[PDB]
Amino acid sequence: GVDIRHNKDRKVRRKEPKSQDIYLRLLVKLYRFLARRTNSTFNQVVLKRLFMSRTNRPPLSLSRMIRKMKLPGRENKTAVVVGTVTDDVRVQEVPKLKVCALRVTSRARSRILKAGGKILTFDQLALDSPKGRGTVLLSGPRKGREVYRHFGKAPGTPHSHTKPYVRSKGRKFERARGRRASRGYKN
Amino acid sequence: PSRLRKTRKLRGHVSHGHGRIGKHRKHPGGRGNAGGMHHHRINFDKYHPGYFGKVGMRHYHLKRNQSFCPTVNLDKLWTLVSEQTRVNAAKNKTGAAPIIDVVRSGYYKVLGKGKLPKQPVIVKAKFFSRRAEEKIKGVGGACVLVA
Amino acid sequence: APSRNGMILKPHFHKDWQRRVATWFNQPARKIRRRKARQARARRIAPRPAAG
Amino acid sequence: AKSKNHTTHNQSRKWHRNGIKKPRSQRYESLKGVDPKFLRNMRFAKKHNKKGLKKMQANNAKAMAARAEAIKALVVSRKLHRLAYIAHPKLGRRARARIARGLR
Amino acid sequence: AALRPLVKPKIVKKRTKKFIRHQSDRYVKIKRNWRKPRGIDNRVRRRFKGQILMPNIGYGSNKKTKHMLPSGFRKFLVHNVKELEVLLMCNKSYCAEIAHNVSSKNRKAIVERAAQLAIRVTNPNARL
RNA sequence: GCCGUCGCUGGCAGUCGGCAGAGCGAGAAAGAGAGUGGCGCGGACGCUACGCCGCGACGAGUAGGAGGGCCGCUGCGGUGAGCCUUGAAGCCUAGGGCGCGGGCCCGGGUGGAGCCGCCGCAGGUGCAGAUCUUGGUGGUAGUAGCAAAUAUUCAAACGAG
RNA sequence: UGGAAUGCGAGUGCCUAGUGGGCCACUUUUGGUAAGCAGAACUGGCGCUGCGGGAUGAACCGAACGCCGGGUUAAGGCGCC
Ligand SMILES: [Mg+2]
Ligand SMILES: [Mg+2]
Ligand SMILES: [Mg+2]
Ligand SMILES: [Mg+2]
Ligand SMILES: [Mg+2]
Ligand SMILES: [Mg+2]
Ligand SMILES: [Mg+2]
Ligand SMILES: [Mg+2]
Ligand SMILES: [Mg+2]
Ligand SMILES: [Mg+2]
Ligand SMILES: [Mg+2]
Ligand SMILES: [Mg+2]
Ligand SMILES: [Mg+2]
Ligand SMILES: [Mg+2]
Ligand SMILES: [Mg+2]
Ligand SMILES: [Mg+2]
Ligand SMILES: [Mg+2]
Ligand SMILES: [Mg+2]
Ligand SMILES: [Mg+2]
Ligand SMILES: [Mg+2]
Ligand SMILES: [Mg+2]
Ligand SMILES: [Mg+2]
Ligand SMILES: [Mg+2]
Ligand SMILES: [Mg+2]
Ligand SMILES: [Mg+2]
Ligand SMILES: [Mg+2]
């Protein structure tokens, strides 16, 4: 007998996409090869994000892509997101962008192209940037989901700003006892 | 579908996933929200603060149409008109400002979140926030109150 | 019994609700019946406007 | 009937399954709970930091010039050692050629 | 004089007896089909010495000789002549078994064609 | 030695062939680099990439969780130019086998009219128990027993008795 | 000169079942004449666990378990069984 624990032997991590999409799996075949046969860590990161689930691939808005592609030294670099590029109506002017994405919404496509930009697919990124050179890999906000408002210390604990689960919002819905000192206590 | 669910995997396993000791009994703890001020108090206090008690005034015969007031922030203001409306106004030299009628778009109050483009505009609305009025005035616009 | 975090729910199923379940399997049949009566009414009152 | 009352038996075994972890440490600790009067001034100190921005630029550039100026003005066995040298893929590259030339 | 396979390695079986179910010798209502004993006190489940044995992945067969017939081939059920021709290019590793519900008339053709293609048939002499 | 699990988030798209040139496992970064001046017609296998291959460690399990089932049952959409009176289902079998197993294949017999594989869909889908339901059958067992109220016998007849 | 040794990849988040009768031993220890009694601390067990030894045995001693061949052992043994 060997003195060892086995509860952590199996690592919980995706080796492939749960999706049965045949176009996504053709891109995984592509980047499985590039990640294996090139020393480029960029390929490994993209291969990993192709396995990732829907909530681990948040959409990247147009306004946020412009901000991150406007930092100094990022001129003529292709912005890359393994996800969806959504349009942002709060933007007034779109610059000339070169972007690679899994999906670009219909209105984001017109605005990027109308500014003189180029929209790639990941099979076109490989031919243009086999090792990922001259790229800017970008991610959407992962905690930008309604669930993360409900996580943390339970709402009924001191200095807990977690959001409760209420069927309705209003004066009659979880506001008397425990939420104001006038009714029992507050914390 | 039933073929993908636990029951098919729990065939032959005596207790069916509920244990040999505690068993699956009918209603231990009570039905529904029983015990909220009692044997279930920690769960309610921990996760539903405010649940018990009363706060604030009653209102009989509430009519939610009377308080109808959709709001729009300034950062979405120019989406209510066409794209050519903004560019034509931006490039024109006479200085004419376009009229944006938020009530026609279905909004009543205008709110101040956001920054406007450097472009005069005339905004019609039932209500304005203080900061919305100043931001509209900072670009050379004018606020118009409708009823 | 409540279990960890969740919503407090009050389903209104404390009466004999199964004695008063209204299904909608006759919905296509109603749509055909109402349509067949609009047409038969339009023919009857023609050339007066079918809408009314 | 009567039952057992209390025990901590088996409890340290449970606590150590996922380890008794020490509290997490971050380089910046929150200012919660510090003296309100002290904190009020620390916010006033931070608020007006930009007043002396130009002086810092002047002093920093002055210091850099002086710092650069001074710097610019300022600036086992013989057999086993020989063999370890020859076996070195780079250093012994020419020593190895001499043996090969000698051998032929 | 029968067709021979490309190789005939020794077939090693870890176990040749069947795993008979617990207490299935004592009752007729208990069939010998294996059922994993799950009673609390069950001494077979606890692997007491001298008791009925339990199947576990350790008894698994060598992958190289798994599903291999004693002749060295591997069977493949066929229902007609057309299904038989899939074994044209693997006639040295896979033999043909004709399904039970193929009439005596059709067995003659499947057996006749298999001989032409050098495919071995496990049950060629049936329904004559 | 073999089986599986886990790890290396390991290797393989280079099957780059006569429009040829076979290598990149080796102690120690980065090119089997490119140029400018001083006869035969030949060469195994592979790669369902959800595939295939290598190396190392590991393997107890109630309650309980999860995965994988080319495990099994009934029906529905597709498909198998599927099977079948030259014999379906079902059933039986000291016949031959396969799989760790759930199970399955084939042979022989009986049977007499329908049935199955594969990709998907669906579920009233898997029994040893519940003093479980209904039906059937045992040992007990040719056993307990055919004992309350006094009682029968002779001859003949019919009749197979 | 990543400022003791040694070993080891870590951090983090959601959802979550069963459990919430325990019992035993070395040592410490309360009540009790004591109890295979009742009640605590520490660690380890049995419970959930087979296997060699203690003839037999939940807990003792050795040792923890995929299916095998060879070798060698532990605790225990070597008149015969
Ligand atoms: Mg082991
Ligand atoms: Mg384990
Ligand atoms: Mg685990
Ligand atoms: Mg279990
Ligand atoms: Mg359960
Ligand atoms: Mg039970
Ligand atoms: Mg319970
Ligand atoms: Mg209990
Ligand atoms: Mg229940
Ligand atoms: Mg519960
Ligand atoms: Mg207790
Ligand atoms: Mg037990
Ligand atoms: Mg195990
Ligand atoms: Mg028999
Ligand atoms: Mg008939
Ligand atoms: Mg049904
Ligand atoms: Mg049954
Ligand atoms: Mg039964
Ligand atoms: Mg008698
Ligand atoms: Mg005690
Ligand atoms: Mg128990
Ligand atoms: Mg344990
Ligand atoms: Mg043990
Ligand atoms: Mg003894
Ligand atoms: Mg041995
Ligand atoms: Mg002895």
B78: chain A residues, CB-CB within 8 Å: 92
Tokens representing D99 are 């043996």
Is the preceding peptide bond at A158 cis, omega within 30 degrees of 0?
no
Could you give the CA distance from residue D13 to residue C39 in angstroms, rounded to a whole number?
81
Å resolution of this model?
Answer: 2.7
Residue-by-residue DSSP string for E34-70:
------TT-TTTTT-TTSPP---GGG---TTTTT--T
Dihedral of alpha carbons A123, A129, A131, A133, sign: negative
Which experimental approach was used here? Answer: cryo-EM
B41: chain C residues, CB-CB within 8 Å: none
Q: Say which of C5, C7, C9 has its CB closest to residue A154.
A: C5
Could you give the CA distance from residue D24 to residue D88 in angstroms, rounded to a whole number?
48
| Cα B1 to averaged position of ligand 16 atoms, centre (Å) | 14
Answer for the pair E49, E81: CB distance below 8 angstroms, yes or no. no
In this structure, chain D runs to a length of: 104
User: Chain C residues contacting B, CB < 8 Å?
Assistant: 1-6, 8, 10
Tokens representing E91 are 């006639």
Amino acid identity of E53?
L
Distances E112 to C37, E56, E120, E124 between C-alpha atoms, Å = 71, 43, 11, 9
Half-sphere exposure of C19 (CA within 13 A, CB side): 3
C5: chain A residues, CB-CB within 8 Å: 150, 154, 165
Dihedral (Cα; E106, E107, E111, E112), 10-degree rounding:
-40
CA of D9 to C1' of G41 (A): 9
Could you give the CA distance from residue D95 to residue D87 in angstroms, rounded to a whole number?
9
Could you give the CA distance from residue A178 to residue A186 in angstroms, rounded to a whole number?
5
Could you give the CA distance from residue E63 to residue E4 in angstroms, rounded to a whole number?
21
Tokens representing B11 are 């065939």
CA of E23 to C1' of F142 (A): 35
- Please tell me which residue lies nearest to nucleotide F86, judged from CA to C1': E105
Distances A153 to A146, A164, B42, D5 between C-alpha atoms, Å = 16, 11, 14, 31
Distances A179 to A65, A185, B137 between C-alpha atoms, Å = 40, 7, 41
